[PDB]
Design a binder for this molecule. Sequence first.
Ligand SMILES: *[C@@H]1O[C@H](CO)[C@@H](O[C@@H]2O[C@H](CO)[C@@H](O)[C@H](O)[C@H]2NC(C)=O)[C@H](O)[C@H]1NC(C)=O
Ligand SMILES: *[C@@H]1O[C@H](CO)[C@@H](O[C@@H]2O[C@H](CO)[C@@H](O)[C@H](O)[C@H]2NC(C)=O)[C@H](O)[C@H]1NC(C)=O
Ligand SMILES: *[C@@H]1O[C@H](CO)[C@@H](O[C@@H]2O[C@H](CO)[C@@H](O)[C@H](O)[C@H]2NC(C)=O)[C@H](O)[C@H]1NC(C)=O
Ligand SMILES: *[C@@H]1O[C@H](CO)[C@@H](O[C@@H]2O[C@H](CO)[C@@H](O)[C@H](O)[C@H]2NC(C)=O)[C@H](O)[C@H]1NC(C)=O
Ligand SMILES: *[C@@H]1O[C@H](CO)[C@@H](O[C@@H]2O[C@H](CO)[C@@H](O)[C@H](O)[C@H]2NC(C)=O)[C@H](O)[C@H]1NC(C)=O
Ligand SMILES: *[C@@H]1O[C@H](CO)[C@@H](O[C@@H]2O[C@H](CO)[C@@H](O)[C@H](O)[C@H]2NC(C)=O)[C@H](O)[C@H]1NC(C)=O
Ligand SMILES: *[C@@H]1O[C@H](CO)[C@@H](O[C@@H]2O[C@H](CO)[C@@H](O)[C@H](O)[C@H]2NC(C)=O)[C@H](O)[C@H]1NC(C)=O
Ligand SMILES: *[C@@H]1O[C@H](CO)[C@@H](O[C@@H]2O[C@H](CO)[C@@H](O)[C@H](O)[C@H]2NC(C)=O)[C@H](O)[C@H]1NC(C)=O
Ligand SMILES: CCCCC/C=C/C/C=C/CCCCCCCC(=O)O
Ligand SMILES: CCCCC/C=C/C/C=C/CCCCCCCC(=O)O
Ligand SMILES: *[C@@H]1O[C@H](CO)[C@@H](O)[C@H](O)[C@H]1NC(C)=O
Ligand SMILES: *[C@@H]1O[C@H](CO)[C@@H](O)[C@H](O)[C@H]1NC(C)=O
Ligand SMILES: *[C@@H]1O[C@H](CO)[C@@H](O)[C@H](O)[C@H]1NC(C)=O
Ligand SMILES: *[C@@H]1O[C@H](CO)[C@@H](O)[C@H](O)[C@H]1NC(C)=O
Ligand SMILES: *[C@@H]1O[C@H](CO)[C@@H](O)[C@H](O)[C@H]1NC(C)=O
Ligand SMILES: *[C@@H]1O[C@H](CO)[C@@H](O)[C@H](O)[C@H]1NC(C)=O
Ligand SMILES: *[C@@H]1O[C@H](CO)[C@@H](O)[C@H](O)[C@H]1NC(C)=O
Ligand SMILES: *[C@@H]1O[C@H](CO)[C@@H](O)[C@H](O)[C@H]1NC(C)=O
Lengths: 49, 197, 441, 436
Amino acid sequence: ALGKLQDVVNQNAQALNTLVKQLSSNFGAISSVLNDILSRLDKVEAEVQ
Amino acid sequence: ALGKLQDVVNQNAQALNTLVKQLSSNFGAISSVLNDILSRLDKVEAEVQIDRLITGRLQSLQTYVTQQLIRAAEIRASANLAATKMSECVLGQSKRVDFCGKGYHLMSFPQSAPHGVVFLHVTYVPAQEKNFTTAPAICHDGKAHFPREGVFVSNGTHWFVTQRNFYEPQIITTDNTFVSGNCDVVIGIVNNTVYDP
Amino acid sequence: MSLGAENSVAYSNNSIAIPTNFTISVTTEILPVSMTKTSVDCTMYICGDSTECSNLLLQYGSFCTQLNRALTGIAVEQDKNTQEVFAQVKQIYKTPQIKDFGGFNFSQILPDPSKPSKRSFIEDLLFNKVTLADIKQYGDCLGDIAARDLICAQKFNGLTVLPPLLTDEMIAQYTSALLAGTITSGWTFGAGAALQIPFAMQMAYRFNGIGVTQNVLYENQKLIANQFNSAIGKIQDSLSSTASALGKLQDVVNQNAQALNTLVKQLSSNFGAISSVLNDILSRLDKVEAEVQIDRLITGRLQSLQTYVTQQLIRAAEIRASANLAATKMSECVLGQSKRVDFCGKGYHLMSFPQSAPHGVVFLHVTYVPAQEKNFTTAPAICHDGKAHFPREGVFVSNGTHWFVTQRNFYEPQIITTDNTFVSGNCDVVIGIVNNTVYDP
Amino acid sequence: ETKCTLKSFTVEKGIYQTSNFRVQPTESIVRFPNITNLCPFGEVFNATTFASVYAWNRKRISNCVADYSVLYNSTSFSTFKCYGVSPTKLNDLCFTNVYADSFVVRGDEVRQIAPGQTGKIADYNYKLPDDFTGCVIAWNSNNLDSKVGGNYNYLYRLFRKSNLKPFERDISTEIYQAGSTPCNGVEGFNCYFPLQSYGFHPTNGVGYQPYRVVVLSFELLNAPATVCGPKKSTNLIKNKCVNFNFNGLTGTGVLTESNKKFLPFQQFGRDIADTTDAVRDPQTLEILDITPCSFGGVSVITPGTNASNQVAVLYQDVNCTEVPVAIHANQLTPTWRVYSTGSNVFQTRAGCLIGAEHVNNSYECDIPIGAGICASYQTSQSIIAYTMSLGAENSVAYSNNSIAIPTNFTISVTTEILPVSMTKTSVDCTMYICGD
Ligand SMILES: *[C@@H]1O[C@H](CO)[C@@H](O[C@@H]2O[C@H](CO)[C@@H](O)[C@H](O)[C@H]2NC(C)=O)[C@H](O)[C@H]1NC(C)=O
Ligand SMILES: *[C@@H]1O[C@H](CO)[C@@H](O[C@@H]2O[C@H](CO)[C@@H](O)[C@H](O)[C@H]2NC(C)=O)[C@H](O)[C@H]1NC(C)=O
Ligand SMILES: *[C@@H]1O[C@H](CO)[C@@H](O[C@@H]2O[C@H](CO)[C@@H](O)[C@H](O)[C@H]2NC(C)=O)[C@H](O)[C@H]1NC(C)=O
Ligand SMILES: *[C@@H]1O[C@H](CO)[C@@H](O[C@@H]2O[C@H](CO)[C@@H](O)[C@H](O)[C@H]2NC(C)=O)[C@H](O)[C@H]1NC(C)=O
Ligand SMILES: *[C@@H]1O[C@H](CO)[C@@H](O[C@@H]2O[C@H](CO)[C@@H](O)[C@H](O)[C@H]2NC(C)=O)[C@H](O)[C@H]1NC(C)=O
Ligand SMILES: *[C@@H]1O[C@H](CO)[C@@H](O[C@@H]2O[C@H](CO)[C@@H](O)[C@H](O)[C@H]2NC(C)=O)[C@H](O)[C@H]1NC(C)=O
Ligand SMILES: *[C@@H]1O[C@H](CO)[C@@H](O[C@@H]2O[C@H](CO)[C@@H](O)[C@H](O)[C@H]2NC(C)=O)[C@H](O)[C@H]1NC(C)=O
Ligand SMILES: *[C@@H]1O[C@H](CO)[C@@H](O[C@@H]2O[C@H](CO)[C@@H](O)[C@H](O)[C@H]2NC(C)=O)[C@H](O)[C@H]1NC(C)=O
Ligand SMILES: CCCCC/C=C/C/C=C/CCCCCCCC(=O)O
Ligand SMILES: CCCCC/C=C/C/C=C/CCCCCCCC(=O)O
Ligand SMILES: *[C@@H]1O[C@H](CO)[C@@H](O)[C@H](O)[C@H]1NC(C)=O
Ligand SMILES: *[C@@H]1O[C@H](CO)[C@@H](O)[C@H](O)[C@H]1NC(C)=O
Ligand SMILES: *[C@@H]1O[C@H](CO)[C@@H](O)[C@H](O)[C@H]1NC(C)=O
Ligand SMILES: *[C@@H]1O[C@H](CO)[C@@H](O)[C@H](O)[C@H]1NC(C)=O
Ligand SMILES: *[C@@H]1O[C@H](CO)[C@@H](O)[C@H](O)[C@H]1NC(C)=O
Ligand SMILES: *[C@@H]1O[C@H](CO)[C@@H](O)[C@H](O)[C@H]1NC(C)=O
Ligand SMILES: *[C@@H]1O[C@H](CO)[C@@H](O)[C@H](O)[C@H]1NC(C)=O
Ligand SMILES: *[C@@H]1O[C@H](CO)[C@@H](O)[C@H](O)[C@H]1NC(C)=O
């Protein structure tokens, strides 16, 4: 019993977890880390990334 | 009739068709065909074109999913209303006004339909009304008499007591009325006689 | 925070509390019905008077049709909400000429013919209590201004507001017809042809519905009419003084205006381009290495339009749910009497009266509240001749010496006769039976 | 037009909203300022001597016309690049503050005059900003800056403590301490003079030959222009859908006389949505305002195309007397012009309806126009507009001693249709996006 409250809690936790883990996507860039882009490229031709 | 089921079907078909036909968009790329991009360009300076196409198609899919969820919420609300009506009007009799048809509800019958349900409501409608002269109470022996159920009516000469939803006049006896107080505070009381068995 | 006032009730196994008086209480309920209908010209919002931007936007063709289809569906749903909320009956019942209603005074809710718009006093107060920030005719924006009003900005950026199908006079006529039907015919006009009845007999029907014998009305008619008139006047002076009410209609209007203003002011974003102005890009760069900037601007503005449309759909669903609730309350409380608890006000429901409001409806619920209770000693049954007696309706009470039978909601003691009780079994199984005598006529 | 908005050849009965498809601009005007002096390209491209790269020369250029077609006969440029502006748009623009930086560098170091470069010249002599706008010009000058025996009058800095800032100049000649021991202001071991001289012989390689470099820096600031392009002004056209060019700013719309005060050293005045509306005419000093040429708020009311082809047009929030000015009916086709005026003209609270006659009757709403007005197709055949009827007028005979009692009844059945479920769909994203 109490499946409805349980899966509401599970849905909220899963949404937060996938929002956290969606930070590892390149989105068509050279890397998913801002530090690598800021460390390997200058002020120009890094704004696109 | 049956416009709701028809346009739900039409909405779903139109959404699928426009999702199919949205594949012919460049999204700012040189072409809308992946084969031309992969045939005219090398591995580098072709990832940007494929990235534009991927972003556009992902946006289209997300828009379709969002509209599907929004439609599903309304469909679920309609299904909840249909389940409530089936429970409260097929499995019983409802006193709620206009919940299951115009007039006073008597019965209901369910029928199936493509992605839907059809309720046949059987109700009672009064007709052929007649004018009458009424009174709140009757003072017979210095005391007021109020009807148990129904009202006092008069055809010009005599007085009768009748039920409210149908005309069925009866002699005003002590088994139809009850006594409460004297005939001094009720506004519009009428002198008459009350039969005693 | 404090939950409320601490209270306790004196409970024993042989005690009752019976009310001896009553009050007639009227309450107000405000429900939104519809909202503003908007239309968006996508090719004018994204590419204002630019042919190259139009040619580039020709690739994104079906998105504009999809957005316009969604907005038109929202608009026709907004009209339909008012259609099933207010157009319940299809007969425009004229107001009666004579106003002999047994002492009841419906002057503040009936229409006033002196005003150009046939509206009541309460309806005028309700319209004056909502700002309804708009009427800007085209041409006034043309010249003598730099569009500080932001309506000219919305019009020049391709955002328009469509007027509703039913004007305020027709809604006022519908409410007047419902009010004339419900005070001259009772609930009969909502289930067929309207049958006339005096108002006192109608209120006797309502009192019999809530469980009180109808002689209470015929003995306290003047007091009930005075209480009803005083409470109507109290609602009138409460609404004529403070503006803290009608918050729902006000913040629906505020939400729509804020959404439109945000959509207008989102045009000043670069979206990762060299500038947010199409003219600078078209005047500083040639045909190539300018399609990328216009493509970025097109993608950003299309995203903004899609976000606005999605939020509008989400708001429209909630507005439709509220309109469905309002239609249900209209059909179940104005056209009849409801036995559901707290569906149409605190207490026992007697009547309801509708009034119009900007994108909404206001219900005045007339209810019955008992008051001035008293303690009594109570028995479940009476054993007279070796057999138990149970009341047909009401309960047995005792004032210390003698026993009486009374109705449950009002104090009206009577002699325990054989016409008030019925006999079932011997006085051996009922727990707490009390010896007494049952009179026989 | 409403066939074109729906992208179909058949139209169902009802009301539709259409996009703008009527008015097209035809005329174009230019409003450049009147400057007559030719710009002194020669005084900077034909000087008898230039400056060293470590002491590059900066000159301000103002109140001139940049034609640059007079340089086609004299000099040919080996390097010509531009950042922030396309080269073909240079004749249509007016600048604000033009700065020319001139020097002479080796032919192998011309590639270092660019943003983001590194090396010897870009680190210690001359550095460009990352957000640089303007152009770089460089050409060979072996027959001018080189002579027999060696030209040693050009110098460059070889050593420095740190890299230069953008547009920074350093002419100090202090002794550079390469090692750890102090130099004490005298040359020696690990103590070098920071400047060194180019050896420009007329017989060395192409990469070791003198090149002359001129860097032009500009900006499109909101200020009166001083340097313009070679364009001729055009007379003002008002109250028409025209293209305009004001001091290099291009646009489209309708020009109308207006008024506003404006601060002198500013030029452009924007709107809430960053749209330019306030300008100063450089030839007449009259501030006009720009209005969009497109108009929105046109709806088409029609029956089905299977029925007929007649339509009615509703203009939203437009007075029925001001309709042809608001839609520019003078420059439209006559088939659109017949819907601008005529006899069937009705003024409603929703606007102006043209093409349907206004009857005095009242029926049920067939096609909802708005504000209590509906329209329908009735009888020849025509399109009529009316005010919708709420219902049948009725009255009830009320008195204080009268009641009405029913004497008969009817049993009535009725339908109620309710949707329950819909179509269940699934997608395959890796097949939809990237098929095989
Ligand atoms: C009102 O109703 C009463 C009862 O039905 C009528 O009285 C009867 O009238 C009939 C004639 O139609 C006589 O034959 C009966 O003998 C009457 N009964 C009694 C007890 O007197 C009366 O006529 C009706 N009045 C009107 C005006 O219709
Ligand atoms: C109803 O009947 C009562 C008699 O029971 C009437 O009361 C009498 O009326 C006469 C004439 O006005 C007086 O002289 C008597 O003194 C009254 N007696 C009492 C006890 O009140 C009464 O008037 C009748 N009402 C109507 C409307 O006819
Ligand atoms: C029931 O309550 C009403 C309302 O409070 C009482 O009516 C009041 O009676 C007093 C004294 O008779 C008057 O001064 C007030 O003006 C009355 N109020 C109104 C609104 O008319 C009534 O007396 C109460 N009844 C009982 C039995 O207690
Ligand atoms: C109904 O209540 C009102 C409020 O006290 C009574 O007073 C009238 O109020 C209206 C305001 O809408 C005025 O225009 C009238 O002039 C007022 N009349 C008087 C006599 O002051 C009104 O009289 C009551 N209705 C009845 C039938 O008594
Ligand atoms: C309980 O109620 C009964 C009935 O009202 C009371 O009996 C009457 O009391 C009065 C005095 O207040 C006498 O004048 C009557 O003659 C009594 N009637 C009978 C039939 O005896 C009784 O007094 C009440 N008891 C209490 C404790 O208040
Ligand atoms: C209620 O009255 C009955 C009389 O009908 C009482 O019953 C009698 O009580 C006496 C005294 O205890 C006994 O001697 C008799 O045998 C009983 N008769 C019967 C038929 O039961 C009864 O006790 C009374 N109850 C109360 C609570 O007073
Ligand atoms: C601008 O001048 C300052 C002051 O001399 C320079 O900062 C010095 O740089 C040297 C070389 O690294 C250091 O040894 C000093 O300690 C610095 N002094 C201070 C106060 O910071 C600075 O390098 C010069 N700017 C450039 C671009 O060369
Ligand atoms: C109540 O209404 C029904 C329905 O109209 C009436 O029944 C009709 O009576 C007439 C005359 O006797 C017949 O010709 C019809 O065929 C009947 N219709 C049906 C469906 O049976 C009935 O007579 C009415 N009753 C009263 C008292 O007026
Ligand atoms: C005295 C300089 C005045 C500068 C004023 C503003 C500059 C705008 C025009 C720049 C053009 C410079 C000449 C470039 C010629 C290129 C032709 C070629 O490829 O051969
Ligand atoms: C033997 C190579 C070891 C170094 C490998 C690590 C890479 C870092 C150095 C790369 C630059 C090499 C010299 C280029 C000098 C600048 C060019 C110029 O004159 O403008
Ligand atoms: C009742 O009487 C009134 C007034 O004479 C009349 O208008 C009405 O039609 C009558 N009702 C019936 C059902 O005859
Ligand atoms: C009904 O109204 C009439 C006229 O106003 C009046 O003469 C009569 O006394 C009233 N009757 C009642 C019971 O109120
Ligand atoms: C009933 O009696 C209890 C206990 O004496 C008391 O607390 C309560 O107030 C009484 N009720 C009334 C209405 O006085
Ligand atoms: C009520 O409770 C009291 C308290 O114990 C008890 O003495 C009495 O018998 C009870 N009466 C009934 C009818 O239960
Ligand atoms: C450039 O300078 C030389 C030398 O003074 C001169 O002969 C020539 O005419 C000049 N050319 C131009 C275009 O000024
Ligand atoms: C300039 O043009 C003239 C003829 O137009 C030509 O004789 C002359 O040689 C040109 N100048 C140079 C430096 O070639
Ligand atoms: C030329 O420039 C002057 C200087 O501001 C200005 O007053 C004038 O209007 C301009 N145009 C003409 C045609 O003289
Ligand atoms: C435009 O129409 C309105 C009616 O809504 C009218 O009041 C106004 O005077 C009209 N304008 C002109 C210039 O006639």
